[PDB]
C-alpha cells in the first residue's frame, strides 16, 4: 500500500535547472545533432513537430523533414484524408523516383491533365499497357499547349521521340548528368527490358541543393511520421498509412500506461513486426517499460506539460517534464531505446535541457503553431494576426458543446516560415551543446549535469531591469 | 515543551502536488464514485455543498442529491426556517410516501386549496377522521376548477369514486404498473384497514429516471443534512432538523479541537446514539481523533484554505489543506471512520488530490456559489451578472459594523445550473481516478501517490504562452 | 574562519508558517494579552508604536496608553521638544496627582490665564508661596470670567472659600465620594501640614470609566517610552525625558551589535542603574546576549522587514524575521529578559505569529502610520486622503538633497482613530491564542508550534478565486 | 558518467540570501573599500564598468578611475579606434607626465594648432630635434592669437624666454611649489642635459585635489584596461592596447573554459609574462582552475545572470551567481589569485554580497549604462529620456538582420552624472561592510555569512505595503 509513500518525491521542469557549463572541444557548429530514434529511423536535428490540427499537415511536415527534422500527420481527419497528405510528403521529393503516375496512349490526354493538375506535374510517363508498364513516351505542358481537343486518345497529340533514359537505380548524381548531356528535365528509369520503375527530375537534383539536411528515406524522400489512436479503426488506419509511405506512426494517447494501449499496441505489433513504432504518453519509468515491452520503438514522454493542456488542472494528474523524461530514459537506456521528450518546451533552452535529461528528440507544438505550415485558423485582434492553436483535447477539436476538455483552444501570434523558427532554435540547440562540451547527444545524456534554480535564478536567468521594445527572434 | 519543536514541518496545499499516472485497468466512465460516509449514509458522488447563506438553500441541497452528492443546509437562520428547508428537500421525491398531508370531509375545500398552494400537490388525500386515517377520497385540481364556493365542506364537492389503492411497501416499479392498468396519476397506499399510510405519483417514478443517481433514503426520497453550531439553542435545533428528516447533521465550528465543542458533542452524541453525526473542523490527527472519540461519525477538515476565508491572515493559524487531509485521514483509518475535505478546492483537478490524500468526500462552496440554486444576490458589474459569496465569518453573515470577522464578503460570477458544474467536475474526477487506475476511491488512498511540484512546475502544469479568449467549461 | 561556512542557514518570515491548532481550553475573550517587559513594565496588550515621527507623538502615546500598550516618543526633534511631548502623555490621566500646578497670590490673574490655556486646565491650585506650597485657595474658569482685569494679583479676585481636601494618597475611588459629597470636580491633595501635594479631578475617575485597560504607572498615569540615539547629546536627553516622566528609554539604533553602541549603553546603564532600559536592533541570538550582558532589559528584534525599510536592498543585510525573533528569544529565556519583535508586521496574525516565535510584544509603524493621531502630513491623491509615512532613515527623516538612505519615503492611507486599529488586531490575536490554546503569550512561547508553507500555501491562505468590493476592517 | 549525477546540486543568486549581522568595530565611514586584484592593479573601490558599447567608452573609463574604480574600453571598434580611446585615458591626468607632445621649430604654427586642438592643449613643448627632445621653448594659446598667419615656422613666433624647469622625477608636490613661485602653469621636465622627458601642469595638481582617490599607475595617471577576444586579430589588438597605455587587458569570452579560449589565452600569456591578465566568464571551479593554469591573473565568474544576457534562455546554461563565484572563489585562493563578479547585480546591496561570497570586485554594466559618460544612443519615451542598453551577444552589438543572439537589445532610463551612481554604490557598500563587521573586503570573504530566503523572505526584505511616489536615489 502506498499509503504510507503517498508523497513519493520531487519533479523538476525545464524552469527550476540550468545545465553547468564545462570544459568544451568543440564549438557550436561542429557539433552533431542528429539523432537515431530506430534502426529505418534517423533525423539530422532532434527535432519533431506535434500531431495536432492546428500545426502539422503535409506542408509543415514537408518543411520540418527538409529542415532534417520529422513531421508527425495529426489524425483529426479520415484515414483516406490522413492517407493522401501522408503520401503528399512523400510525393515532395523524388515523388516518383519509385512508384511513378503514367497513363497508356489508350487513355485521352484529358485524363493526363486531370492527373497532371491534381499531383501538379509537367509531364506524365506514358506506357503501352498499365500492366505491362513498357515506357512507350511521356506527355508534357509543352504537349498539352499545343493540343486543342483534350478529348482525345493521348496517342493522337504525343512524344514518340528518342527516348532517353536510365536504368533502374542510377543516383541523382548519375541523372543529372544524363540530364544535362541531353539538355533534358525528366529522365525516365526502365528496367532491361524497357519497363518504367520511376522518374528523376531536375527539380529533385536542385532540392537536394537546396535543402542539403533533409531527412530522407532509402529513396531520397522526405521522412513522415503519422498518428493513430487505439480505437476499432487503428489497424485500417495504420496499414492506410503505411500502404501511403508513413516511415513511422505513432500511437497517440492521453494515458499510455493504460491496459487498453498496451493491449491494441501489442496486436499492432504483432501484426507490423518490422515497422517502426512510437507510442503514447507516459511520465514514468514503468510506464515506459510498459510500453517498450508491448513491443514500442520509441515512447514519447509528458502527461500535462502542454501549453494548451488543462490534464493536469482538471484531472490533478501528471509529473514535472524534466523529471519524467529523465525517470523514462532510465528505462531507454536498459532496453537502448529511445525517447522523445514531448512538451512544455518554449525556449530553445529548454529543449537542450530536454535532451540532456535523457530525451533523443523533443516534439514540439506551441512553437510551429502559427507558422505559415501551420493548418491553424488566422485572427486578427488590435490589427496583429493570429493562428489558431487548440490541444487535441479540447472541445473544439474533439468536435465532431462541452465535453469534459483535457486542453484548451487558443491562437498565437503568426510566426511566418517554419524554415525560420527552426533556424533559431538550433542555433540555441548548438550554442547550448557547445557550453557543456557535448560533440552529440549522446555526450549530452552522459556529461551533461544541472543546477536547481529558485523562483529568483529564474528571474536572473531572463532579461531584467531593462526596457525591451524590440525583443530578439529567439527570446520572446 | 515545544519551545525546541517550534518549528514542526512542512505542510502542502493542492498546488504544491500532482497525481502521478500508473499502471490502469479501469477506463473513466467505469470508475466507482460511490462512498460511503457512515452506516446510513452513502453518497454516488464524492461531492458536498457547504452549509453557507449563499450556497446551500434547499434547491441546492435538491440539485446536489439528484446529482447523487449531499447538501448541508446552512443555520443562518430561525430553527423554524431551517428544519422547512429540511422538509422541502424530503418532500421533494417520494415526498408523501410516508407521512402524506390529509384533510378531513370535514374540512373546507378552502383549507384543502390551503394546503395546496402552500406545498403545492395536485391532490389532497381525503381522511374520514385525522386520527384514524382511513382513505375516503382524493380532492384534485379538477375538484377545485369545478368548485364555486370554497367557503364548504371538502365532502359537498367530493370524489368519492372506486378507490384504487396499493399496500404499504409497494414499491415504485409495481406502482407504476397500477398506476398504468388504471389511467392515474396519484395511488394512495393504505394498510389491510384502508388506513392511509402514504402516496406514489407518477411524478416520483418519473424523477426516478430523471435523476437515476440521486443519493437517496431507505424510502426513495432524497438525502439531506443540515448544520447546528455549539449554542444554548442547539439541542432544540438538532432536534427540530432530525425532525424534519434530516438524514445527519453537521456541526459546524471554527475550531473543532476545542474543550466547549467537545463537550456539546459528546452531549448531543449521548442524546442521538443512533443518528449520523458530522463534526466541526479540525487540522490535526489529534483534532480527528478528539472529535472521534466524542462520538462523531465523520470529520470535516479545513482550517484556514477557504477561498472567502481569512482566518490564516487575521488569526495567523492553520495548515495547508493536502497535509490536513492526509494527517487527519491517518486516524480515519485507525477509526474505520470517514473524513470530508473542507474547502481550497479550485479546481475539479483539487478533488482528485483531496480525495487522493485520504478523503472520502469533499465540500464545495466557491464553486457552486453563482449558480441557480445557490441563495446569494445578484449583482451587476460591467454588464455581467454576479453572485454575492461570503465567508460564514464575514461581518455581514455574521450580522443580526464590524465584529472582527474572520472571513471577508465577496461575490461570483453567475454560473448557471448546479447540475452542469456537477457534471464538469465529475468527469475530471473520473479521467483524475483513471489515470492512476483507481476504480474506487478505496484504491486511491491505498495506491496513489503525489510528485512534489516547485512553483515553476505549477506554471507548467496550467496552460501557458497562449493566448485564449473563449474558456473551457472546466478550466476559468 | 567562516569562509567554510558562508552559507548558513536557511530563515523565516511570517509568510513561509501558519501557526498549527490544537486543543483549546480557553475562549479568545478569556485569553490573558498582559505582558511584563520589565519590574517597572507591563503593559495590558503585547502592542507598541514604533518611535517614528510620521507615527508616535504624544496623541498617539496617549490612544496607545488608554488602549493597554506602550507609545514610543520618536527622537526626531529637541531634547525640549521630545521632553514637552512627553509630559504631555503624564499630564494626560491623573496629570497633576502629583507636581501639581500652582501659583501663588503675589502672582496676576493674567499669569493664571496662561498656565490654564498653556496646559489647558480649568483650575490652578493656588499656594500661600512657591516654596511653601501651603494651599491657600484654587482659581478657576468661573473665576476669570468674572474678572474684568488680568493685569492684577489673582489675589483680590479670589476663591478663600472653605477648601475641602483630601490627605495624600487617598485613591480615586475615596476621592470620588468626597467629591460626589461636596458636589465638586476639584479635590487638593494636601498632607497634615496643608501642603499642596497633587490635585484629584472628576475627569480622571471619569477617564478610570472610559479606558478601563489603559497602562499606567504608580500614580495612575499613562506609560510612556521615548527614544534617544547613541551620541554626545544622548545622557542629556535621556535625563531630560526621564525627567519628564518617561517610564523607559528607546536606544534606538541602526546596528545594536556595534561597538561603540555597546560602549554607550554600558555607560548608559553604570549611569541609571535602576531605569527601564530598551536597547537598539538586532537579529541574532549573539547581538542579543551582548545588549543584554551591555546592561539592557528588553531587546528589540529587527534588522530589514520594515515596510520602509531598504537595508536588505541597499546593504544587503538581514534575517527573516521570524527566524530573528527565535533565535534572540532563544538568549531572552536564558537571561529571564524580553524580546520586541519590530516590524514587517502588516496583519492581526503575523502578530500572533511573532509573539509565538518568542516575542513578549511587537512594535508596529505601518499599521498606525495613517491614523488620527500620527503626525503623517495628509496628501491627497484620487481624492483619497493619504498620511506620509517615511523610514527614520530615509533622505527626507534623515534631513535637518539625498544623503545614503537605508529606507524610503512614502505614505498610506487614512485609518481613523488608532482605538480602532488596535481593537480589530487584539481580536485577531484572541482569535489566534484561541485556536492554539495559549490563555496567555507565555503558554504561547511554550506551545505554539508553526508549519512551513510554500508560495502556493500562502496563497490559499489568503481569500482567492472571488471578487471583493467592500473589504474587512482586518484584512485589507 | 555524470548521467547518474545529472541533477548536481543547487545554486543561489543574490536574492536567495542576506548577509547576517554581526558584531563590529568599524564604522561605515571607516571601512577598507581597496582591492588588490594583481601585483599592478590595485582599486580603491571594488568597482569595475563592463566592456559594454553602450556602457564604457573613454568618458566613462575615465570618471570611473577618478572615483577610484577601473573601466573596461570595449572592442566594438577597431583596433585603432580603442587604442586611442585607451590612450585618452591615459592623457587624462599627468598627460604628458611622461612621453609628451612637441614640436621643433622648423614646423609651422600650424601643425602646433592642429595638435592643441586634436589633443586640447595651451601649450606645445618645442625641442630643437624631434630626435635629440633639447627642450627649446613652448607655444601657447596667448602665442596663437598673437600670430597672424598660422603658413609660418613656429619659431618666427616664439617663446625664447628664460625657460623655467624641473629634473626628471620632481613630484607634483615639488612641481606645485616650482609653478607658484614662478607664477607660470606648465612645468617642463628635463633631463641634466636638458631633454625634455615630460610636462607638469596646474590642472595636474588641482585634479588630484578634486579626485583624491582616483586609480591610478605609477605615473599618476588613471588606471585603465581593455577588451580583446579570441581572434586572428588579438594579439595585434592586445599590442595596440598595451602600447598604448593599458594597465591590463580583459580577454572577454563567452565560454572561457573552451580549448581554444584557453589555448589563445597560453599562448598570450607566453607572449605577454609580465602584463596583467584578465580572463572570459566561467562560473564553476574547473572554469577558473583551467584559466589560472592557462595564465590568467584575474578570472571574472558570471555565465547568464547579465540583466540583458538570455544565454540560460536561449542555451539553457548558467549557474546562479552567488554560487558561481563561490565556487570559483575556492580556486582563486587555492592560487592566491583574484575574481571580479560579472553580472546580475542591480542594487548596491547585490554587490556587498557578490563580494561577501568571494570576489574581489563586481563588474557592473545595466547600473552604469543611462549616465552622461555612457556611450548608449538616447530615446525618449512618455516624454522622458532613455539610453540604450544592449548585450554584445544582441543582434544589433553583433553587427557589422538576427544572426542567433544570446543577448537583448534594450534601453534605461537617463541616470545623470556616473559619479553619483558610483557615490550611492558605496555609501551601501560601506553600511554593508559595517554590519557584519568587515574592516576591509578579506575579512568579508573570511567572516560575513548567508542566511537563505524564500520568496516571501525576499518580499519583506524590500520595502512594502506603502504608495511611494518618489524613490530613493538608492532604491529604483
Ligand atoms: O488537449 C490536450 N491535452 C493534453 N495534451 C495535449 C492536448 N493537445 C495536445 N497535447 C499534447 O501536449 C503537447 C504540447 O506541446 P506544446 O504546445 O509545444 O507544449 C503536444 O505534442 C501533445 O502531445
Ligand atoms: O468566514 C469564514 N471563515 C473561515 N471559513 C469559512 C468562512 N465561511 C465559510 N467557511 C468554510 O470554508 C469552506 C470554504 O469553501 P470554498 O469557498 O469552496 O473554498 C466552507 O465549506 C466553510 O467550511
Ligand atoms: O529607514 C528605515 N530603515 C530601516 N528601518 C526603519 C526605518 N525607519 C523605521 N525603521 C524600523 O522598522 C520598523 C518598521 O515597522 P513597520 O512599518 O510596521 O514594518 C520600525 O519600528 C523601525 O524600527
Ligand atoms: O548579449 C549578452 N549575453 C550575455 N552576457 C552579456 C551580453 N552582453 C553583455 N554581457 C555580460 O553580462 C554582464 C551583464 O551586466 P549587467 O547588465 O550589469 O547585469 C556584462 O559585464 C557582460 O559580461
Redesign the interface.
Same mark, same amino acid.
Given at each position: 500500500?502506498?499509503?504510507d !509513500?503517498?508523497?513519493? $518525491? $520531487?519533479?523538476? !521542469?525545464?524552469?527550476?535547472?540550468?545545465?553547468? #557549463?564545462?570544459? @568544451?572541444?568543440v564549438?557550436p557548429n561542429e557539433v552533431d545533432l542528429k539523432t537515431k530514434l530506430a534502426d529505418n529511423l534517423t533525423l539530422n536535428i532532434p527535432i519533431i513537430t506535434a500531431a495536432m490540427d492546428t500545426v502539422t499537415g503535409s506542408k509543415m511536415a514537408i518543411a520540418i523533414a527538409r529542415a532534417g527534422g520529422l513531421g508527425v500527420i495529426h489524425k483529426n481527419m479520415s484515414i483516406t484524408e490522413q492517407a493522401e497528405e501522408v503520401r503528399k510528403v512523400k510525393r515532395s521529393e523524388n515523388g516518383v523516383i519509385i512508384d511513378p503516375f503514367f497513363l497508356t496512349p489508350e487513355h485521352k490526354v484529358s485524363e493526363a491533365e486531370e492527373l497532371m493538375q491534381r499531383y501538379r506535374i509537367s509531364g506524365v510517363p506514358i506506357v503501352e499497357t498499365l500492366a505491362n508498364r513498357k515506357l512507350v513516351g511521356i506527355i508534357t505542358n509543352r504537349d498539352m499547349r499545343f493540343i486543342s481537343d483534350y478529348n482525345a486518345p493521348i496517342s493522337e497529340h504525343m512524344t514518340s521521340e528518342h527516348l532517353v533514359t536510365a536504368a533502374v537505380g542510377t543516383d541523382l548524381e548519375t541523372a543529372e548528368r544524363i540530364l544535362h548531356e541531353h539538355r533534358i528535365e525528366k529522365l525516365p528509369l526502365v528496367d532491361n527490358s524497357g519497363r518504367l520503375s520511376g522518374l528523376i527530375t531536375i527539380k529533385d537534383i536542385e532540392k537536394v541543393i537546396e535543402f542539403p539536411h533533409a531527412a530522407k528515406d532509402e529513396f531520397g524522400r522526405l521522412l513522415v511520421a503519422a498518428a493513430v489512436g487505439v480505437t476499432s479503426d487503428t489497424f485500417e488506419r495504420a496499414e492506410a498509412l503505411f500502404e501511403a509511405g508513413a516511415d513511422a506512426i505513432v500511437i497517440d494517447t492521453a494515458?499510455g500506461?493504460?491496459?487498453?494501449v498496451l493491449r491494441k499496441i501489442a496486436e499492432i505489433r504483432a501484426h507490423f513486426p518490422n515497422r517502426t513504432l512510437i507510442a503514447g504518453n507516459?511520465? !514514468?519509468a514503468?510506464?515506459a517499460r510498459?510500453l517498450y515491452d508491448a513491443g514500442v520503438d520509441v515512447v514519447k514522454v509528458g502527461? +500535462? /506539460?502542454?501549453?494548451?493542456?488543462?490534464?493536469?488542472?482538471?484531472? +490533478?494528474? +501528471?509529473? /514535472?517534464?524534466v523529471?519524467a523524461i529523465?525517470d523514462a530514459a532510465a528505462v531507454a537506456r536498459e532496453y537502448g531505446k529511445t525517447i522523445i521528450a514531448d512538451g512544455?518546451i $518554449?525556449?530553445?533552452?529548454? *529543449?537542450? $535541457?530536454a535532451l540532456?535529461?535523457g530525451g533523443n528528440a523533443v516534439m514540439l507544438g @506551441?512553437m510551429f503553431a502559427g507558422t505559415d505550415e501551420a493548418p491553424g485558423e488566422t485572427e486578427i485582434?488590435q490589427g496583429r494576426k493570429?493562428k489558431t492553436?487548440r490541444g487535441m483535447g @479540447? *472541445?473544439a477539436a474533439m468536435k465532431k458543446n462541452?465535453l469534459? /476538455?483535457?486542453?484548451?483552444? +487558443?491562437?498565437?501570434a503568426y510566426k511566418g516560415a517554419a524554415s525560420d523558427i527552426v533556424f533559431?532554435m538550433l542555433?540555441?540547440i548548438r550554442?547550448?551543446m &557547445?557550453?557543456?562540451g557535448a560533440g552529440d547527444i549522446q555526450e549530452l545524456?552522459?556529461?551533461?549535469?544541472?543546477?536547481?534554480?529558485? &523562483?529568483?535564478?529564474? *528571474?536572473?536567468?531572463? #532579461?531584467?531591469?531593462?526596457? *525591451?521594445?524590440?525583443?530578439? #527572434?529567439?527570446?520572446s
Open positions: 500500500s502506498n499509503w !509513500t503517498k508523497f513519493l $518525491k $520531487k519533479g523538476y !521542469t525545464f524552469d527550476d535547472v540550468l545545465l553547468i #557549463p564545462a570544459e @568544451s572541444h564549438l494515458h500506461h493504460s491496459a487498453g507516459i511520465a !514514468t514503468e510506464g510498459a502527461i +500535462g /506539460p502542454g501549453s494548451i493542456c488543462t490534464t493536469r488542472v482538471v484531472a +490533478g494528474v +501528471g509529473v /514535472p517534464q523529471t529523465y512544455g $518554449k525556449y530553445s533552452g529548454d *529543449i537542450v $535541457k540532456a535529461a @506551441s485582434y493570429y492553436y @479540447s *472541445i462541452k469534459v /476538455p483535457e486542453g484548451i483552444e +487558443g491562437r498565437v533559431q542555433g540555441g550554442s547550448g &557547445g557550453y557543456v545524456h552522459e556529461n551533461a549535469q544541472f543546477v536547481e534554480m529558485s &523562483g529568483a535564478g529564474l *528571474i536572473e536567468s531572463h #532579461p531584467h531591469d531593462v526596457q *525591451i521594445t524590440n525583443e530578439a #527572434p529567439n527570446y
